[PDB]
């Protein structure tokens, strides 16, 4: 307990003698409690151009620790042996061609400069001086400020912990360990436009249905056993690298100190997965791959209830299954953190729930022992929040595109993050959403129309600033003043590995829409008179926005 986290706790309490009290009214049943201390907008452009969505409930809803505080039952001994053998095989497989390595101050500095306000932090040598400090400490087996939360110098300590984590484990993302080519099941770096093609390729594999089971609170279900298995990547590092990485796992993952928000609370726990940590996506992806392989093994009859309870379980059958079929089984899945799609060899997988429940990965909103429902159409499978619709262009070429309920897209676009933002900043974020819709959601009639209206409304030279999403699947091709059709051709034709015919598309007229029935099923307002009124009266609203923005140069895209 205290040896590992004590120093971290002492600095906060000593620094906060101004108000350090122990509350006996603290609601912490699972996390350890140490003490606490006292502490202290709609996007108008988009809203004006989407009047019909002013009513829609999902749009209004978006404008406006209960699960974290639980314990996960320890997995059984046989399960623990199976997870261990599987983790060792997977880590060796992921490391077959790549070697782990330390990440550097330069790499981290360059990432920050192109992604706030830590830019000022990385430009000051004082920041790097303290980092050299937890590092000497993180190297002797201790950390003193390496803590996380759920114009004060405390910010430097937080950013410092993140850099130290990046230095030790950033190579998983920086060297693409979870790319599809390296990991087989991974989709890191593919991007949203490619996920649909990946599911369609998965559907070609012979087998049973496609399963996409959601886990309830995945981060809260990461056990002490999962963390031990995740740490096995350490055996592949160089001694200098092994020392720092071991420090990150032992002192910040296997032990943690957190701050929650009026007053602030200091709590600690030896399990669960940290919120903002750098290795979270990669470690979650690795653990999900291991669990899904284990579920496939149970599905094939390789693992039984007796095997899960057996403390003296023999490795040979697991090693043989992994060695002869493990890569093929990995190839049947698309896994991004807690999102997974699995196409097992047959439908026995639907009822293979002993190991999955035993590892703590309990499926959300379904009785624990009810069989999973699979899909026979890859187009109905949900993954990373999306539908993947397959489309035929007028020229006969086929595209695979992503659908999501239209109210979710319009609702997000209508929200600006942060107050005190000028119209120019607001118009630019609107342009970013509009251009994102042109690139990814061009097949929705309402979004293409709203997209044309926003771009007509804002000055053509203006550069979209601010991100429309934090998703790891977003490549931000829409953050540009380059012609969107040129970008569309580059993304969907030129750089598209699934498009053999490279003939460019010269007009938006040749860029297809979803079928009218499907567009309506996915939330389109097309066919309602209110939509027709909006479409007819859109130029008037565009002129209204242009007049408020001022005398700048605009283009008509209707
Ligand atoms: C898997 O891709 C996503 C998942 C979720 C979301 C919603 C959000 O994060 O704001 C957006 C996306 C993307 C939109 C455009 C390129 S990625
Ligand atoms: Zn530390």
Angle at CA 497, nearest 5°, toward 492 and 501?
70
Whether residue 396 is found in the same domain as residue 522 = yes
Q: What is the resolution of this structure in A?
A: 2.3
Task: Please state, in angstroms and rounded to a whole number, the distance separating the CA atoms of residues 257 and 259.
Answer: 7
Q: Which of 270, 297, 327 is the last residue of a domain?
A: 270
Pocket of ligand 1 (CB under 6 A): 192, 384-385, 412, 436, 440, 469-471, 473-474
Residue 397 burial (10 A CB sphere; 0-12, 13-18, 19+): middle
For a pocket test of ligand 1, which of 434, 444, 469 has the largest count of ligand atoms closer than 8 A to its C-beta? 469
Q: Which of 355, 384, 413 is the last residue of a domain?
A: 384
Whether residue 349 is found in the same domain as residue 488 = no
Whether residue 160 is found in the same domain as residue 174 = no
Task: Please state, in angstroms and rounded to a whole number, the distance separating the CA atoms of residues 159 and 120.
Answer: 12
End-to-end CA distance of the chain: 65
Our measurement of the distance from residue 387's CA atom to the centroid of its chain's CA atoms, rounded to an integer in Å, reads 17
By the 8 A CB rule, do 83 and 290 touch? Answer: yes
The closest residue, in CA terms, to atom 14 on ligand 1 is 474
CA distances to 161, 242, 256, 327 from 248, in Å:
9, 10, 10, 30
Which domain, by its residues, includes 309?
A: 71-102+170-253+271-384
Whether residue 48 is found in the same domain as residue 117 = no
Instruction: Identify the DSSP state of 215.
Output: B
Q: How many domains does the chain have?
A: 4
Whether residue 346 is found in the same domain as residue 478 = no
The closest residue, in CA terms, to atom 16 on ligand 1 is 474
By the 8 A CB rule, do 347 and 208 touch? Answer: yes
Q: Which of 365, 384, 403 is the last residue of a domain?
A: 384
Range 532-537, long-range pairs (CB < 8 A, 24+ positions): 533/52, 534/51, 534/52, 535/449
By the 8 A CB rule, do 470 and 192 touch? Answer: no
* Paired tokens of 48: 């004006």
- Closest of 473, 485, 492, 489 to residue 399, by C-alpha: 492
Whether residue 425 is found in the same domain as residue 512 = yes
Whether residue 471 is found in the same domain as residue 456 = yes
Produce one character per residue of 220-242: b if its CB has 16 or more CB atoms within 10 Å, e if not: bbbbebbbebbbbbbebbeeebb
Whether residue 444 is found in the same domain as residue 510 = yes
Structure determined via: X-ray
Whether residue 288 is found in the same domain as residue 345 = yes
Task: Please state, in angstroms and rounded to a whole number, the distance separating the CA atoms of residues 20 and 356.
Answer: 43
Element (H, E) at 119: helix 119-122
Q: What is the 3-state secondary structure (H, E, C) of 260-286?
A: ECCEEEEEEECCCCCCCCCCHHHHHHH
What's 11's domain CATH number?
3.30.70.2840
Task: Please state, in angstroms and rounded to a whole number, the distance separating the CA atoms of residues 353 and 291.
Answer: 11
Whether residue 110 is found in the same domain as residue 241 = no
Whether residue 87 is found in the same domain as residue 60 = no
Task: Please state, in angstroms and rounded to a whole number, the distance separating the CA atoms of residues 116 and 120.
Answer: 9
* Paired tokens of 436: 């994102």
Task: Please state, in angstroms and rounded to a whole number, the distance separating the CA atoms of residues 25 and 272.
Answer: 24
For a pocket test of ligand 1, which of 383, 474, 477 has the largest count of ligand atoms closer than 8 A to its C-beta? 474
Whether residue 357 is found in the same domain as residue 282 = yes
């Amino acid at each position: 307990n205290m040896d590992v986290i004590g120093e971290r706790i002492k600095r906060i309490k000593e620094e906060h003698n101004s108000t350090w009290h122990y509350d006996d009214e603290n609601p912490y049943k699972t996390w350890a409690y140490h003490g606490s201390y006292e502490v202290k907008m709609i996007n108008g452009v988009v809203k004006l151009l989407t009047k019909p969505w002013d009513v829609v409930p999902m749009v209004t809803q978006m404008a406006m620790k209960e699960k974290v505080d639980t314990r996960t039952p320890r997995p059984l001994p046989g399960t623990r042996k199976v997870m261990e053998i599987t983790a060792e095989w997977l880590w060796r497989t992921l490391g077959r061609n790549k070697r782990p390595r330390l990440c550097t101050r330069e790499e981290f500095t360059k990432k920050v400069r192109t992604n706030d306000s830590a830019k000022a932090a990385v430009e000051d040598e004082e920041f790097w001086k303290l980092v050299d400090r937890e590092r000497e400490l993180h190297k002797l087996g201790k950390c003193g400020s390496c803590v996380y939360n759920m114009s004060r110098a405390i910010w430097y300590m937080w950013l410092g912990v993140r850099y130290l984590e990046f230095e030790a484990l950033g190579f998983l993302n920086e060297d693409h360990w979870f790319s599809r080519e390296n990991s087989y099941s991974g989709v890191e770096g593919e991007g949203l436009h490619k996920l649909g093609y990946i599911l369609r390729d998965i559907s070609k594999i012979p087998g049973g249905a496609m399963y996409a089971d959601d886990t309830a609170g995945w981060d809260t279900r990461i056990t002490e056993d999962d963390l031990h298995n995740e740490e096995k990547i350490i055996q592949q590092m160089d001694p200098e690298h092994r020392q720092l990485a071991n420090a990150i796992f032992k002192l910040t993952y296997q032990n943690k100190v957190v701050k929650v928000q009026t007053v602030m609370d200091i709590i600690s726990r030896k399990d669960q997965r940290g919120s903002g940590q750098v290795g979270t996506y990669g470690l979650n992806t690795f653990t999900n791959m291991e669990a899904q392989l284990v579920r496939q093994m149970e599905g094939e009859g390789v693992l039984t209830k007796a095997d899960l309870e057996n403390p003296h379980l023999l490795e040979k059958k697991i090693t043989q299954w992994l060695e002869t079929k493990g890569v093929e089984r990995l190839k049947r899945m698309a896994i991004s953190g807690d999102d997974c799609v699995v196409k097992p060899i047959d439908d026995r997988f639907a009822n293979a729930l002993l190991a999955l429940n035993d590892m703590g990965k309990v499926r959300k909103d379904i009785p624990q022992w009810q069989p999973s429902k699979g899909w026979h159409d890859w187009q109905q499978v949900p993954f990373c929040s999306h539908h993947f619709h397959e489309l035929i262009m007028k020229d006969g070429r086929k595209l695979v595109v992503p659908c999501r309920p239209q109210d979710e897209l319009i609702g997000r676009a209508r929200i600006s993050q942060g107050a005190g933002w000028s119209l120019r900043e607001t118009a630019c974020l609107g342009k970013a959403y509009a251009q994102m819709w042109s690139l990814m959601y061009f097949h929705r009639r309402d979004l293409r129309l709203a997209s044309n209206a926003i771009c007509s409304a804002v000055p053509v030279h203006w550069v979209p600033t601010s991100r429309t999403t934090w998703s790891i699947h977003a490549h931000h091709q829409w953050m540009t003043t380059e012609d969107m059709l040129t970008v569309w051709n580059r993304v969907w034709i030129e750089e598209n590995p699934w498009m053999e015919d490279k003939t460019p598309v010269t007009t938006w007229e040749n860029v297809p829409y979803l079928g009218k029935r499907e567009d309506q099923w996915c939330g389109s307002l097309i066919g309602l008179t209110s939509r027709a009124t909006w479409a007819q009266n859109i130029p008037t609203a565009i002129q209204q926005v242009r007049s408020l923005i001022g005398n700048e140069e605009f283009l008509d895209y209707m």
